Design a protein around this ligand. Structure first.
Ligand SMILES: [Zn+2]
Lengths: 99, 48, 287, 161
DNA sequence: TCATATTATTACGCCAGACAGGG
DNA sequence: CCCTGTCTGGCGTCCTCTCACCTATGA
C-alpha cells in the first residue's frame, strides 16, 4: 500500500493538497484509504525583543507543522504513475512510500 | 482484372456505377519481383 | 509515370537505406499462441504491426494517433500491406562473397581479378591464403599461399607482410584494384600482342573493366556485408488445416544465417584463438 | 612436453565429448600422450571448443578424431594442426565447472544509483537512490516523479539491484 | 517445452562452353 | 602453340481435374 505523508505550515493549503491527491488517486485507481489527520507539531520559540536589556520583554513565536496521512490500498499501473503530472499547491512537502 | 488491388476496387465501383473505365496502376506481383531481386545484393529501382 | 528500369549493384549504404531495422534473433514466432518475436525475424519495430492501425500488444484502437510507439510495444502503427514493402537487413559478422558473381560462368570475380575459379573458391572456403600488398618480399599480388607456404613465410617475412583469406581478403583485392589503371594496361596489352586466344581473353576482360567504370558500380560491392531480407508478407507463414504452421523455405534459410551469425559474433566476442572461427565463418559463407 | 590444441565438437554435447575423450584415452592406453581435457557445459563459454593438452603423433590424432561427435582440429592445415597457447585455455580452467550462476548473495543489492522497484506501486520502474536507511531497512530512491526527482521510501526486497 | 542445427545412391540426350594435354 | 577429349552447366508443352501427406529431440 502507498502511504502518503503531507507536511505543511499552512493548514488550509495542506487540506487543499490532500483533496487534490485524493482526486488523483480515485479516478485512476480504487479504494483510496482516506485523509487521516496526525498530530500537529507546534514548535515554539521564545526570544528577547530588546536590542540590549529587558528580560521580561519577550515574543513567543511558533511554527505549526501539520501532518496529513493519505493511504492508497491498491497501487494499479495507471494510478501510481499519475502523481508525476497532478501539480499541488506550493509549500507542501509530500512523502509517498509504497509498502 | 488480376493483380492491382486499388485498381480492381476502383473498377468494381466504376462497374456498379455504369462508368466503364479503368485506373491502371501497377501489378503488385511486379513489386514482389522487385522485393525478391532487391533481397539479393542487386539494386533494382524505377527511374525518373 | 516512369521510363526505364535501372539495375545496378547494392552498396551497403544502399541496403541500409532500404532497411527499417536490423533482424537479429532467428526466432520466428512464439508458436504456442499467436504473437511473433521481439525482436526476431518477424519483428514489430523493424517492420510493422500485424493488425491494421493497431499496436499488436496494446494501445490505439481507433483512428486518431497513427504512429506513436510506446516502450511496452516496440511496434510501428500503419496498414496490413505495409510489411510487404518493408525489408530487413542482417548484419553478417563475417564477409561473404555473392554466389551470382562468383559462379555465373564466367564468374564476375573470376575474369576481374585475373584468378582461376578453382583458386578463388579454395581461398573463399577457408582452404587457401591470398596475399595483399605484401611489401619488400618475393611474392606476387594474385599469387595465393597454402598452409606450408604461409608457415614458412610467417617465420620468414614476419614484418611487413599481409596474407589473408576468405571474402575479407577477396574484398580487399577488389577494393584495392585501380580500375582505370587496368584499362590502359589491358588496352596497351591488346595492342602489343598478336596472340589470337590472348586477344579474345584480353578483350573479354577489358570489356567488363571499362563497363564497371562507366557506371557507379564498385568492386567491393560484390561481397555481401549487409545481407538484405525479403519482406515477411512475401515469405508468408500460414497454417494449413490443423494446428501447425507450414513454414516456407526462405524462413529456414534466413533462420540458419541468423543462427550462424549470432554464433560467429559470440565466438568473436570471447577473445578466442584466431583460427577457431575459420569453420564458423566458412559455415556462414556456405549458409 | 605436451602442448595445447583446440578440438571442435557438436556444440551442446561438449561435456559428453570430454568424458568420451577421457574414456578413449584410458581404453587405447596412450596415457603418456594426454595431460588434461577442458570441456565446459553450463546449465558455458566456450560452448563449442574443447581444449586438449596433447602431443602430436598421427596415432593420437586419429584417436582424437575417432572419439565420437568430434569434427576435427582447428589449425593452419590438416596435416600438421596448430597449437595455440597455455594462457588461452588457462582462463577456461578457472571457470571450467566451478560453482557459477544462479547465486546472488550480497552482490545483488549494490546501492550506488542503479535499481528497479517492482514490489510496489512503481510498476516496472527504476530510479537513483542517494541516501539509504539500511539500519531501518529503507531506501531514498529518487524516481522521476512529478516532473522532478522526488525520492520514495522503498523496501530492499521491494526494489531490485 | 524450448532451443540444437545437418548424413548412409547410380539407370537422359544433346549442346554449347571452358580447360588441361600434346605434336 | 593450335586441335582436342573431357568435364560442367543448362535447356527440355501448354491448360485443367481428383486424391493423400507433411522434423526429431527431451531432461
Ligand atoms: Zn502501442
Amino acid at each position: 500500500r502507498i502511504r502518503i505523508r503531507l507536511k505543511a505550515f499552512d493548514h488550509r493549503l495542506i487540506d487543499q493538497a490532500t483533496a487534490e491527491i485524493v482526486e488523483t488517486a480515485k479516478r485512476t485507481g480504487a479504494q483510496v484509504r482516506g485523509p487521516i489527520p496526525l498530530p500537529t507539531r507546534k514548535e515554539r520559540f521564545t526570544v528577547l525583543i530588546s536590542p540590549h536589556v529587558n528580560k521580561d520583554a519577550r515574543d513567543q513565536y511558533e511554527i505549526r507543522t501539520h501532518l496529513r496521512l493519505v493511504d492508497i490500498v491498491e497501487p494499479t499501473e495507471k494510478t501510481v504513475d499519475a502523481l508525476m503530472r497532478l501539480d499541488l499547491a506550493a509549500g507542501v512537502d509530500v512523502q509517498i512510500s509504497l509498502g | 482484372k488480376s493483380d492491382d488491388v486499388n485498381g480492381r476496387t476502383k473498377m468494381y465501383k466504376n462497374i456498379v456505377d455504369g462508368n466503364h473505365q479503368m485506373e491502371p496502376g501497377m501489378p503488385e506481383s511486379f513489386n514482389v519481383l522487385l522485393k525478391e531481386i532487391r533481397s539479393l545484393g542487386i539494386n533494382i529501382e524505377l527511374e525518373d | 509515370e516512369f521510363d526505364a528500369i535501372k539495375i545496378a549493384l547494392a552498396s551497403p549504404d544502399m541496403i541500409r537505406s532500404w532497411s527499417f531495422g536490423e533482424v537479429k534473433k532467428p526466432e520466428t514466432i512464439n508458436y504456442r499462441t499467436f504473437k511473433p518475436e521481439r525482436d526476431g525475424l518477424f519483428c514489430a519495430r523493424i517492420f510493422g504491426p500485424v493488425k491494421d492501425y493497431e499496436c499488436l500488444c496494446g494501445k490505439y484502437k481507433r483512428l486518431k494517433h497513427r504512429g506513436v510507439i510506446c516502450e511496452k510495444c516496440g511496434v510501428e502503427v500503419t496498414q496490413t500491406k505495409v510489411r510487404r514493402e518493408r525489408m530487413g537487413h542482417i548484419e553478417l559478422a563475417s564477409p561473404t562473397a555473392h554466389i551470382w558473381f562468383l559462379k555465373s560462368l564466367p564468374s564476375r570475380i573470376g575474369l576481374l581479378l585475373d584468378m582461376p575459379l578453382r583458386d578463388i573458391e579454395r581461398v573463399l572456403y577457408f582452404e587457401s591464403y591470398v596475399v595483399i600488398e605484401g611489401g619488400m618480399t618475393n611474392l606476387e599480388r594474385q599469387q595465393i599461399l597454402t598452409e606450408e607456404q604461409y608457415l614458412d613465410a610467417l617465420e620468414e617475412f614476419g614484418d611487413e607482410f599481409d596474407a589473408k583469406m576468405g571474402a575479407e581478403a577477396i574484398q580487399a583485392l577488389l577494393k584495392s584494384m585501380d580500375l582505370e589503371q587496368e584499362c590502359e594496361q589491358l588496352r596497351e596489352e591488346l595492342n602489343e600482342t598478336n596472340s589470337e586466344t590472348k586477344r579474345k581473353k584480353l578483350t573479354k576482360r577489358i570489356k567488363l573493366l571499362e563497363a564497371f567504370v562507366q557506371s557507379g558500380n564498385k568492386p567491393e560491392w560484390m561481397i555481401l556485408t549487409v545481407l538484405p531480407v525479403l519482406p515477411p508478407d512475401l515469405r508468408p507463414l500460414v497454417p494449413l488445416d490443423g494446428g501447425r504452421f507450414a513454414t516456407s523455405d526462405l524462413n529456414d534459410l534466413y533462420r540458419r544465417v541468423i543462427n550462424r551469425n549470432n554464433r560467429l559474433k559470440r565466438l568473436l566476442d570471447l577473445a578466442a584463438p584466431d583460427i577457431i572461427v575459420r569453420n564458423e565463418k566458412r559455415m556462414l559463407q556456405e549458409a | 612436453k605436451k602442448r595445447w590444441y583446440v578440438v571442435q565438437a557438436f556444440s551442446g554435447f561438449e561435456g559428453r565429448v570430454a568424458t568420451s575423450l577421457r574414456e578413449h584415452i584410458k581404453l587405447h592406453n596412450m596415457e603418456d600422450l594426454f595431460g588434461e581435457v577442458m570441456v565446459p557445459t553450463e546449465e558455458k563459454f566456450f560452448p563449442g571448443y574443447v581444449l586438449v593438452q596433447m602431443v602430436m603423433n598421427d596415432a593420437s590424432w586419429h584417436l582424437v578424431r575417432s572419439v565420437p561427435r568430434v569434427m576435427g582440429f582447428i589449425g593452419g592445415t590438416s596435416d600438421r594442426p596448430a597449437p595455440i597457447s597455455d594462457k588461452e585455455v588457462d582462463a577456461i580452467m578457472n571457470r571450467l565447472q566451478q560453482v557459477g550462476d544462479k547465486p546472488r548473495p550480497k552482490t545483488l543489492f549494490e546501492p550506488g544509483e542503479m535499481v528497479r522497484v517492482n514490489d510496489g506501486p512503481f510498476a516496472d520502474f527504476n530510479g537513483v537512490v542517494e541516501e539509504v536507511d539500511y539500519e531501518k531497512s529503507r531506501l531514498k530512491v529518487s524516481v522521476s516523479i512529478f516532473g522532478r526527482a522526488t525520492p520514495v521510501e522503498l523496501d530492499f526486497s521491494q526494489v531490485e539491484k
